[PDB]
RNA sequence: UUCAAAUGAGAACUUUGAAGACUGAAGUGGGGAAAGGUUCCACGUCAACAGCAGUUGGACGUGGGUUAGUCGAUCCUAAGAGAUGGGGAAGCUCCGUUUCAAAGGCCUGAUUUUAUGCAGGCCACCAUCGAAAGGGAAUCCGGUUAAGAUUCCGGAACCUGGAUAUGGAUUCUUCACGGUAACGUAACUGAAUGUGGAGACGUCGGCGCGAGCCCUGGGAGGAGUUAUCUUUUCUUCUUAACAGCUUAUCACCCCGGAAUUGGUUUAUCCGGAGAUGGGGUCUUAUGGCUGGAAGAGGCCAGCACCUUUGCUGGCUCCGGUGCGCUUGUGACGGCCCGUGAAAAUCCACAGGAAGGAAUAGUUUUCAUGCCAGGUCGUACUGAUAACCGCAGCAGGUCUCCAAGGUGAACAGCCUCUAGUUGAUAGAAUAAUGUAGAUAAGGGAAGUCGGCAAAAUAGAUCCGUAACUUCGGGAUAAGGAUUGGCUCUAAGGGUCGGGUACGAUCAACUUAGAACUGGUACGGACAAGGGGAAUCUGACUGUCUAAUUAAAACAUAGCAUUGCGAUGGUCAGAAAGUGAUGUUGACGCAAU
RNA sequence: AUGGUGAACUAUGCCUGAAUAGGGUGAAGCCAGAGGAAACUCUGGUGGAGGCUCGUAGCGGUUCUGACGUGCAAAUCGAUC
């Protein structure tokens, strides 16, 4: 039910006690007027709401995923 | 034969009065320490229509001499009273439209409304749209005071008996024709079930002293004795004269 | 463009009820719908609503009055008379 | 063309049974029932909707922070500012004229 | 097809009409259109300075 | 209604395919309330039953089926019903419901025998039942069944109660700051008591906006037609509760000080009690963007194979228009001798009892976190066969959703979606019928009587008498006109213009003018006969369900009567009984 | 005669709910204009009143003294109203 943009805040969520699972979605999407680009939504299933953080920059996306806690049960796709 | 209409009204089945919408009973303040030694101020907080009444009520609120709180009385608005006006109730109150004073405390010719028959009965005389009573004199020793009610009747009451200065609001209401059956229809819809009215002369004998015959006609004098009995008293009960009132009325 | 010769607001009733009753209604009708002067705020913005209740558009004071007109002849003389009677009692 | 049924068992058009047509992700029309509209709280003095205050149906006011139920002046959510302007002025002026009456009628008692 | 012939003016003679001139298009609608448009010409004209408030104000009530 | 197949001993009647029609969204569609009670669904199956039949069934046999913290009940009060101290009554019982009654329970303090005795203060509100349409805490979308689903599955929320820590906030100026102000916010102690708000409220009119529906352009797909013509016809292109930000008519604030009065609605209201102008504050209906969420659903293509049935790819995009239609909502306006419920419940404010920090306190109305949410209903019918009429009866029985054309239109007539195609059948077409039509010349001569029937009818224009309460009478009467096609003219929106015009996009109305036909044209449907008088009731309204709708009753209007409460009229066996009466002569009662 | 049972029909009141295509007419209020020495009189608009009106659904039940009259039906069916 929540969207999130502070990439710092996000991280802190995923290390909260109640957070057992997560999921990464990937969408094809097109930019501005012309070409496409790879959108990636990071979803953290909290106890009472699903936080989802969108990273348009596919770059930011990769070296985000390797930040993800080694203990979190991530759902890929 | 059958029980006639006017005896049926008394069991109040479909004849009780339609009441759902009414504001509350109109009443003076209880005749307490304040009101009988001095006076007490209130404010009309609203003057408002009461279903099936002809005259608007005024909600007037007061402080409670004995507790921290408000107490709201429901008055009948005298013509000219208004929201925000201050209302004074008491023996030692001043003579203004809206205040409530003991008929002993007011000069002859005073014009008041909602007056009590016995002190404290919280008001009984002249309440209807337009009516009032007039003080036509006092008699200090045994403190009685004498008024003329709207009927024309002169009557005397305790000088302690309270009344409210001025006349009741909404006057003239009856100079305007009802014009159609529907406006009487709605009129009684908010009073009681007394409309419309079948002439007994249009009924059969089972139904009414007047009923039956091969032409419609009352068949005997329609002036019935006081000492008549239920099912008998229809028409002009106890009528001491009858016929069109030629000549000026007005009590002598 | 004058619309009606004499029935005025009373034209809603058509031919019904007979002239003389319509006459009598037209009067109080005109009385009762009209806009009146406000004693308190000065603007002429008192209109009726339910008999004997008169309220101000802006400023919002409500007065009890006649069923079809703000002040009633009787009420007014009664105002004059109490006035006079009060005068005696502190003079 | 797509028509639509009530959702609760009550088949009548009452104030508690208002409907809204709605287009779902299935690509179809479905009714939704609709709570009666909330009305704006009113000034206790003058009576207008008092501004600054949220408007919900009554029990919903207990699921809402106290800031949604006030403005921050004396008599916040209760009476309407202009009404409190009047209250202050008159309070002052009257308490003042009390002092006036006291000393005037006091002097009566010294020259009469 | 037909709709075209309509907004080409066709099929609209006295013989094709069944509702009163009123019911087809209300007098009131005609007016409110017209009155709103004069009203709105006055506003911009005033606001542009093309016409001064005093003149506008007379044209308003003449409108 | 028809052809054929299938099944079966058996087929006018079952099943499937095909064709022909129908209901025509005011439904023969999709659901419900009352009532039924298993009729629902499946398998088996024809003795009775379904006024022919039967292989079929709402029949017969055997089974299966109705899942809830959020939908209802349950809670609240309405008219009203009805216990209790009492009062009547031989008594069954009747009256009273806060009434002539010693009518009761909460917050915590007091306890550290110990568990709950008393120490404060309040509160005096006096049962209870009464709404499956009134009030009311909270759930949605996709998927799934032979038969259930806002109830199951998936996912995503939210309410109430209970627990509670962590973070934030607050505090050395203890109980936040900011803004001139309207007011702002993530928070930002608050008992008794008092007050205010919400719950919470008529009706109709036009005007404004929303939603869904309707119409429609481009594009990307699938389908149909193609002798000929049509860049064509038909169809898919969707987005829930909930959450963040944003969004408003109204209202309000600050600056200002107005005649040459201005501003202004379709509707004439507003201003020295401060207009117009400029700047700001507010409600969040509603909408927008994002999260929910493309992973769903929708539409296609390309491979796979008795199989569970897969698997793999795509596309699911951008717009337009309005006196449209339905519904919603707003700011207004009309009306009233009519002014259009209640209570439970929720919040706020006034108040300041009290409690509370610097060596560390106060704070769960800010965020996040934990546990829990019982009981009963839930199938289906809702009617030319599931209900009431002895019945599968042409009767009766409360409601919501509602497409295209014609047209004023929710009319009639035709159509899409859905649903039907049920209702004994065959052959003939005598009399007499019932229902539907026509008739030369005459035209009410028929008949108690123009009964029946015929005539009239839309719209535009023209024209319109007596009489009248001046409102009417009036569509009075009487007339012309109306198709098709092709043109002409008038009626609008939006932009930039130093402090006259230009440019483009989108609408059916109205009037004029040509041409044209077997002089037809409201071409079916739809749709007033008119006039002159007498009698009679003023009018609208009312009744004899099932032989009387009328002149009968009612009504407004007029007039008469009774009554100031220790009362009038009326109820009761009685009464500390009752109607009028939440009443008071501008009233109630009786003619 | 005595003691009992009925307001599921219907009559009337009360409480709480719900329902009614599309037309014609054009009442108060309002705006602009005209005439007149004056008093005052006129015109065009706007607006949208009514136990108003044409007419569906609704509600009713006038005539055919129509159907039916061992009925579909112990009150129905059709047209007309
Ligand atoms: Mg009563
Ligand atoms: Mg009656
Ligand atoms: Mg009578
Ligand atoms: Mg009478
Ligand atoms: Mg008789
Ligand atoms: Mg007799
Ligand atoms: Mg006698
Ligand atoms: Mg007689
Ligand atoms: Mg007689
Ligand atoms: Mg349902
Ligand atoms: Mg606030
Ligand atoms: Mg707010
Ligand atoms: Mg008009
Ligand atoms: Mg318009
Ligand atoms: Mg415009
Ligand atoms: Mg003006
Ligand atoms: Mg057959
Ligand atoms: Mg058809
Ligand atoms: Mg239809
Ligand atoms: Mg059927
Ligand atoms: Mg069903
Ligand atoms: Mg049943
Ligand atoms: Mg079955
Ligand atoms: Mg057999
Ligand atoms: Mg059977
Ligand atoms: Mg048989
Ligand atoms: Mg057989
Ligand atoms: Mg069985
Ligand atoms: Mg069984
Ligand atoms: Mg609920
Ligand atoms: Mg319960
Ligand atoms: Mg009792
Ligand atoms: Mg109850
Ligand atoms: Mg309920
Ligand atoms: Mg309810
Ligand atoms: Mg589903
Ligand atoms: Mg199942
Ligand atoms: Mg089902
Ligand atoms: Mg679930
Ligand atoms: Mg979950
Ligand atoms: Mg909680
Ligand atoms: Mg802060
Ligand atoms: Mg309260
Ligand atoms: Mg209130
Ligand atoms: Mg209500
Ligand atoms: Mg479509
Ligand atoms: Mg919701
Ligand atoms: Mg502004
Ligand atoms: Mg500012
Ligand atoms: Mg409706
Ligand atoms: Mg009102
Ligand atoms: Mg509140
Ligand atoms: Mg103390
Ligand atoms: Mg909290
Ligand atoms: Mg419990
Ligand atoms: Mg069901
Ligand atoms: Mg059936
Ligand atoms: Mg039986
Ligand atoms: Mg039947
Ligand atoms: Mg069916
Ligand atoms: Mg048959
Ligand atoms: Mg035959
Ligand atoms: Mg002939
Ligand atoms: Mg002839
Ligand atoms: Mg003859
Ligand atoms: Mg002749
Ligand atoms: Mg003859
Ligand atoms: Mg004769
Ligand atoms: Mg003869
Ligand atoms: Mg005839
Ligand atoms: Mg002929
Ligand atoms: Mg005539
Ligand atoms: Mg022509
Ligand atoms: Mg043009
Ligand atoms: Mg009559
Ligand atoms: Mg009549
Ligand atoms: Mg009869
Ligand atoms: Mg009989
Ligand atoms: Mg009749
Ligand atoms: Mg007379
Ligand atoms: Mg006694
Ligand atoms: Mg009944
Ligand atoms: Mg309604
Ligand atoms: Mg209508
Ligand atoms: Mg017409
Ligand atoms: Mg009409
Ligand atoms: Mg002149
Ligand atoms: Mg009208
Ligand atoms: Mg009528
Ligand atoms: Mg009519
Ligand atoms: Mg019509
Ligand atoms: Mg009918
Ligand atoms: Mg009727
Ligand atoms: Mg009859
Ligand atoms: Mg009939
Ligand atoms: Mg017959
Ligand atoms: Mg026969
Ligand atoms: Mg009819
Ligand atoms: Zn005023």
Curated annotation (Swiss-Prot), chain A:
Miscellaneous comment text of the record: Present with 50200 molecules/cell in log phase SD medium.
Protein name as catalogued: Large ribosomal subunit protein eL38
Assigned protein family: Belongs to the eukaryotic ribosomal protein eL38 family.
Signal peptide stretch: none
Family matches, as PANTHER family: 60S RIBOSOMAL PROTEIN L38 (PTHR10965), LARGE RIBOSOMAL SUBUNIT PROTEIN EL38 (PTHR10965:SF0)
Cellular component, GO annotation: cytoplasm; cytosol; cytosolic large ribosomal subunit
A single BP term in Gene Ontology: cytoplasmic translation
Purpose of the protein: Component of the ribosome, a large ribonucleoprotein complex responsible for the synthesis of proteins in the cell. The small ribosomal subunit (SSU) binds messenger RNAs (mRNAs) and translates the encoded message by selecting cognate aminoacyl-transfer RNA (tRNA) molecules. The large subunit (LSU) contains the ribosomal catalytic site termed the peptidyl transferase center (PTC), which catalyzes the formation of peptide bonds, thereby polymerizing the amino acids delivered by tRNAs into a polypeptide chain.
Pfam families: Ribosomal_L38e
Gene name as annotated: RPL38
Assigned keywords, A-Z: Cytoplasm, Ribonucleoprotein, Ribosomal protein
Subcellular location: Cytoplasm
Chain segments annotated as coiled-coil in the UniProt record: none
Originating species: Saccharomyces cerevisiae (strain ATCC 204508 / S288c) (Baker's yeast)
GO molecular function, one term: structural constituent of ribosome
Main localization category: cytoplasm
InterPro entries referenced in this protein's UniProt entry, alphabetically: Ribosomal_eL38, Ribosomal_eL38_sf
Curated annotation (Swiss-Prot), chain B:
Subcellular location: Cytoplasm
A biological-process GO annotation: ribosomal large subunit biogenesis
Keywords: Cytoplasm, Isopeptide bond, Phosphoprotein, Ribonucleoprotein, Ribosomal protein, RNA-binding, rRNA-binding, Ubl conjugation
SMART domains xrefs: Ribosomal_L2, Ribosomal_L2_C
Any Pfam family hit: Ribosomal_L2
Cross-link (Glycyl lysine isopeptide (Lys-Gly) (interchain with G-Cter in ubiquitin)): 45, 92, 118, 144
GO molecular function terms listed in the Swiss-Prot or TrEMBL record: RNA binding; rRNA binding; structural constituent of ribosome
Disulfide-bonded cysteines: none
Modified residues (Phosphoserine): 51, 94, 158-159, 248
GO cellular component terms listed in the entry, alphabetical order: cytosol; cytosolic large ribosomal subunit
Subunit structure: Component of the large ribosomal subunit (LSU). Mature yeast ribosomes consist of a small (40S) and a large (60S) subunit. The 40S small subunit contains 1 molecule of ribosomal RNA (18S rRNA) and 33 different proteins (encoded by 57 genes). The large 60S subunit contains 3 rRNA molecules (25S, 5.8S and 5S rRNA) and 46 different proteins (encoded by 81 genes).
Protein function: Component of the ribosome, a large ribonucleoprotein complex responsible for the synthesis of proteins in the cell. The small ribosomal subunit (SSU) binds messenger RNAs (mRNAs) and translates the encoded message by selecting cognate aminoacyl-transfer RNA (tRNA) molecules. The large subunit (LSU) contains the ribosomal catalytic site termed the peptidyl transferase center (PTC), which catalyzes the formation of peptide bonds, thereby polymerizing the amino acids delivered by tRNAs into a polypeptide chain.
Curated annotation (Swiss-Prot), chain C:
Gene3D superfamilies: 2.20.25.30
SUPFAM superfamilies for this protein: Zn-binding ribosomal proteins
One Pfam family hit: Ribosomal_L37ae
Compartments where located: Cytoplasm
A GO cellular component annotation in the UniProt record: cytosolic large ribosomal subunit
Residue numbers carrying Phosphoserine: 39
Alphabetical UniProt keywords: Cytoplasm, Metal-binding, Phosphoprotein, Ribonucleoprotein, Ribosomal protein, Zinc, Zinc-finger
GO BP annotations listed: cytoplasmic translation
InterPro entries referenced in this protein's UniProt entry, alphabetically: Ribosomal_eL37/eL43, Ribosomal_eL43, Ribosomal_protein_eL43, Ribosomal_zn-bd
GO molecular function: structural constituent of ribosome; zinc ion binding
Zinc finger (C4-type): 38-59
Comment field (misc): Present with 44600 molecules/cell in log phase SD medium. There are 2 genes for eL43 in yeast.
Record's subunit section: Component of the large ribosomal subunit (LSU). Mature yeast ribosomes consist of a small (40S) and a large (60S) subunit. The 40S small subunit contains 1 molecule of ribosomal RNA (18S rRNA) and 33 different proteins (encoded by 57 genes). The large 60S subunit contains 3 rRNA molecules (25S, 5.8S and 5S rRNA) and 46 different proteins (encoded by 81 genes).
Family, per entry: Belongs to the eukaryotic ribosomal protein eL43 family.
Protein name per the record: Large ribosomal subunit protein eL43A
The species this protein was found in: Saccharomyces cerevisiae (strain ATCC 204508 / S288c) (Baker's yeast)
UniProtKB/Swiss-Prot annotation, chain D:
GO molecular function, one term: structural constituent of ribosome
Compartment(s) where it occurs, according to its Swiss-Prot or TrEMBL record: Cytoplasm
GO cellular component: cytosol; cytosolic large ribosomal subunit; preribosome, large subunit precursor
InterPro entries: Ribosomal_eL34 (IPR008195), Ribosomal_eL34_C_sf (IPR038562), Ribosomal_eL34_CS (IPR018065)
Protein name: Large ribosomal subunit protein eL34A
Keyword Membrane applies: no
GO BP terms, alphabetized: cytoplasmic translation; ribosome biogenesis
Quaternary structure (record): Component of the large ribosomal subunit (LSU). Mature yeast ribosomes consist of a small (40S) and a large (60S) subunit. The 40S small subunit contains 1 molecule of ribosomal RNA (18S rRNA) and 33 different proteins (encoded by 57 genes). The large 60S subunit contains 3 rRNA molecules (25S, 5.8S and 5S rRNA) and 46 different proteins (encoded by 81 genes).
Family according to the record: Belongs to the eukaryotic ribosomal protein eL34 family.
Organism this protein belongs to: Saccharomyces cerevisiae (strain ATCC 204508 / S288c) (Baker's yeast)
Keyword Cytoplasm: yes
PANTHER family tied to this protein: 60S RIBOSOMAL PROTEIN L34
Keywords: Cytoplasm, Ribonucleoprotein, Ribosomal protein
Domain of life of the organism encoding this protein: Eukaryota
More info: Present with 23600 molecules/cell in log phase SD medium.
């Amino acid at each position: 039910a929540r969207e999130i943009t502070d990439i710092k805040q996000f991280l802190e969520l995923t290390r909260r006690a109640d957070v057992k699972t997560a999921t990464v979605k990937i969408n094809k999407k097109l930019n501005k007027a012309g070409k496409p680009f790879r959108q990636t939504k990071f979803k953290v299933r909290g106890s009472s709401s699903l936080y989802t953080l969108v990273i348009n920059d596919a770059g930011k996306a990769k070296k985000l995923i390797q930040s993800l806690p080694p203990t979190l049960k991530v759902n890929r796709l | 034969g059958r029980v006639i209409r006017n005896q049926r009204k008394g069991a109040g089945s479909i004849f009780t009065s339609h009441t759902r919408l009414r504001q509350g009973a109109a009443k003076l303040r209880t005749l307490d320490y304040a009101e009988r030694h001095g006076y007490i101020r209130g404010i009309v907080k609203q003057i408002v229509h009461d279903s099936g009444r002809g005259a608007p009520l005024a909600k007037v609120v007061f402080r409670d001499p004995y507790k921290y709180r408000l107490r709201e009385e429901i008055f009948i608005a005298n013509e000219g009273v208004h929201t925000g006006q201050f209302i004074y109730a008491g023996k030692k109150a001043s003579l203004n439209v809206g205040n409530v004073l003991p008929l002993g405390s007011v000069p002859e010719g005073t014009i008041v409304s909602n007056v009590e028959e016995k002190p404290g009965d919280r008001g009984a005389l002249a309440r209807a749209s337009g009516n009032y009573v007039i003080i036509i004199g006092h008699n200090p020793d045994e403190n009685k005071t004498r008024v003329r009610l709207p009927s024309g009747a002169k009557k005397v009451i305790s000088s302690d008996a309270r009344g409210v200065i001025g006349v009741i609001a909404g006057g003239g209401r009856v100079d305007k024709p009802l014009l159609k059956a529907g406006r009487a229809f709605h009129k009684y819809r908010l009073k009681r079930n007394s409309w419309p009215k079948t002439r007994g002369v249009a009924m059969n004998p089972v139904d009414h002293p007047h009923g039956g015959g091969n032409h419609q006609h009352i068949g005997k004098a329609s002036t019935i004795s006081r000492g008549a009995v239920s099912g008998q008293k229809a028409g002009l009960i106890a009528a001491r004269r009858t016929g069109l009132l030629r000549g000026s009325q007005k009590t002598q | 463009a004058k619309r009606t010769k004499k029935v005025g607001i009373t034209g809603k009733y058509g031919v019904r009820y007979g002239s003389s009753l319509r006459r009598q209604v037209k009067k109080l009708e005109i009385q009762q719908h009209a806009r009146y002067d406000c004693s308190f705020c000065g603007k002429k913005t008192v209109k009726r609503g339910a008999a004997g209740i008169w309220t101000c558009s802006c400023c919002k004071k409500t007065v009890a009055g006649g069923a079809y007109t703000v002040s009633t002849a009787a009420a007014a003389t009664v105002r004059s008379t109490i006035r006079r009677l009060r005068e005696m009692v502190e003079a | 063309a797509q028509r639509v049924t009530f959702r609760r068992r009550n088949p009548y058009n009452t104030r508690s049974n208002k409907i809204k047509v709605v287009k779902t992700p299935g690509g179809i029309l479905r009714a939704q029932h609709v709570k009666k509209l909330a009305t704006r709280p009113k000034c206790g003095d003058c009576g207008s909707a008092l501004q600054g205050i949220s408007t919900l149906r009554p029990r919903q006011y207990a699921t809402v922070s106290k800031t949604h139920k006030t403005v921050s002046r004396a008599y916040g959510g209760s009476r309407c500012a202009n009404c409190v302007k009047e209250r202050i002025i008159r309070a002052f002026l009257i308490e003042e004229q009390k002092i006036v009456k006291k000393v005037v009628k006091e002097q009566t008692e010294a020259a009469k | 097809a037909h709709a075209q012939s309509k907004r080409e003016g066709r099929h609209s003679g006295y013989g094709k009409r069944k509702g009163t001139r009123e019911a087809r298009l209300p007098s009131q609608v005609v007016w409110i259109r017209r009155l709103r448009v004069l009203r709105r010409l006055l506003a911009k004209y005033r606001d542009a300075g093309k016409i001064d408030k005093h003149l506008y104000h007379v044209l308003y009530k003449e409108s």
